[PDB]
Amino acid sequence: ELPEDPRWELPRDRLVLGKPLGEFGQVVLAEAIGLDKDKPNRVTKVAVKMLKSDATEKDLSDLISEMEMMKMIGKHKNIINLLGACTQDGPLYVIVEYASKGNLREYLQARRPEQLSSKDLVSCAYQVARGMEYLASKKCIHRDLAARNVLVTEDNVMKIADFGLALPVKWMAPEALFDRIYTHQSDVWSFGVLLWEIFTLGGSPYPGVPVEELFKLLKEGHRMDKPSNCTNELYMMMRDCWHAVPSQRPTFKQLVEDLDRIVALTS
Ligand SMILES: CNC(=O)n1ccc2cc(Oc3ccnc(NC(=O)c4ccc(C5CCN(CCO)CC5)cc4)c3)c(OCCOC)cc21
Ligand SMILES: [Cl-]
């Protein structure tokens, strides 16, 4: 039996569950009635994460921990924000903001040659940087930053997902891969691969490279090549994110500052 929290508790009769959206815990589309108490007759489209039918006691503990983490972090434009929850007299439902256009990898893959400009791709990169600047300032390490874990809203807002949970190897920094040392600097390495994903329109990184070979290539100092539709300045930003010593990588503050200047100058 879970403790009630009046700040976040939505009644179950205010939540109409819809189609399944995604299958590490089950997610469904839903409609919430009267979230903003200013307008109690308004319907809001929401994503509702829950446990699977064959879920353990440890899975419940993780999903509770995930909910409590999201309360502490607070609201930002470029993250999947908590909107409410159903904890009492039924299954745990963690209600969050709905992102109608899916994850960023599929969004880009679908829109390969409506078309997206150069300015749209750098804007997309800036919003992911701005959202990670926030999560870093709230002391939250992602551990798994990628285009699959960025969602896209109806109004083209990039929202970071699956942040701070208690193949992925191609996004991990060497220190994270070898020693399991996850830091804010290892999330920058992962952001570098996320840039490479954006400017390849959802490309698969290190293609035809097995797991055993990828350990050696990074140790020896090999990196991914420049994309075709991509400037030199933006590739230097990728290469700086992929610096071997973690202290020498840029911060998300610097990346936000650099990307803000680039979006302004791009057409
Ligand atoms: C730290 N904890 C958290 O961050 N989280 C807590 C709860 C939680 C819930 C999450 O699920 C959500 C949230 C918001 N939106 C979604 N959207 C979709 O799945 C979606 C996917 C694909 C389509 C496509 C449908 C078909 N057409 C085709 C053209 O018409 C193209 C769009 C449309 C929609 C899922 C989540 O996202 C990551 C995992 O997703 C399974 C992170 C979460
Ligand atoms: Cl609420």
Architecture per CATH, domain 12-97, reads as 2-Layer Sandwich (3.30)
Pocket test for ligand 1, best of 73, 75, 80, 142 (most atoms within 8 A of CB): 80
* SS3 track for the chain: CCCCCCCCECCHHHEEEEEEEECCCEEEEEEEECCCCCCCCCEEEEEEEECCCCCCHHHHHHHHHHHHHHHHHCCCCCECCEEEEECCCCCCEEEEECCCCCEHHHHHHHCCCCCCCHHHHHHHHHHHHHHHHHHHHCCCCCCCCCHHHEEECCCCCEEECCCCCCCHHHHCCHHHHHHCCCCHHHHHHHHHHHHHHHHCCCCCCCCCCCHHHHHHHHHHCCCCCCCCCCCHHHHHHHHHHCCCCHHHCCCHHHHHHHHHHHHHHCC
Q: Cβ(256)–Cβ(133) under 8 Å?
A: yes
Query: How far does the centroid of ligand 2 lie from the alpha carbon of residue 24, in Å?
Result: 25
Q: Is 144 noted as a catalytic residue in this protein?
A: yes
What is the number of the ligand closest to the CA of 161? 1
Q: Rg of the chain over CA atoms, in angstroms?
A: 20
* SS3 track for 20-33: EEECCCEEEEEEEE
- Residue ranges of the domains in the chain? 12-97, 104-265
Gap between the terminal Cα atoms of the chain: 55
Instruction: Tell me the C-alpha distance between 25 and 219, whole Å.
Output: 35
**Domain range 104-265, its CATH number among 1.10.510.10, 1.20.140.10, 3.30.9.10, 1.10.3720.10:** 1.10.510.10
